[PDB]
Write the structure tokens for this entry.
Amino acid sequence: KSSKVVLSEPRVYAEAQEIADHLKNRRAVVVNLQRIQHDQAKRIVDFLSGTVYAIGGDIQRIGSDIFLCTPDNVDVSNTI
Amino acid sequence: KSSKVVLSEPRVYAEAQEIADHLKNRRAVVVNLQRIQHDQAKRIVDFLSGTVYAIGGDIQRIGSDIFLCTPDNVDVSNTI
């Protein structure tokens, strides 16, 4: 009865695979593309947009070029 | 057997209380201070730094003036 949050900073769709592999284990991942080139960041998001959904997870934008990836076993909300 | 991620954007320690109250329910919170004034953002972090720890949780910086708050029931790691 526990969860995980993993900080992931890929530079290419090929490395973004690691994010999906974490999701397959019902882990949450923190994706920061702030230091990632325009084309690199895009390819990562495009990759994840397909893959993350397909494997039960989803993507939440939480800041400037920063996203989270979570499995179906995690809810998303907000507050102020 | 589930977890939650809540996006929280307080403007003052007084509102940051909501973050702690989520932690008390074993929820994760996403704290984005990018749009929050220097003094406001500081007071929030200072508040959380004490409170979040005290109630079993912790704080992870994941981006520019962006933090997560998690309970003791969540692990933190990274990958590239």
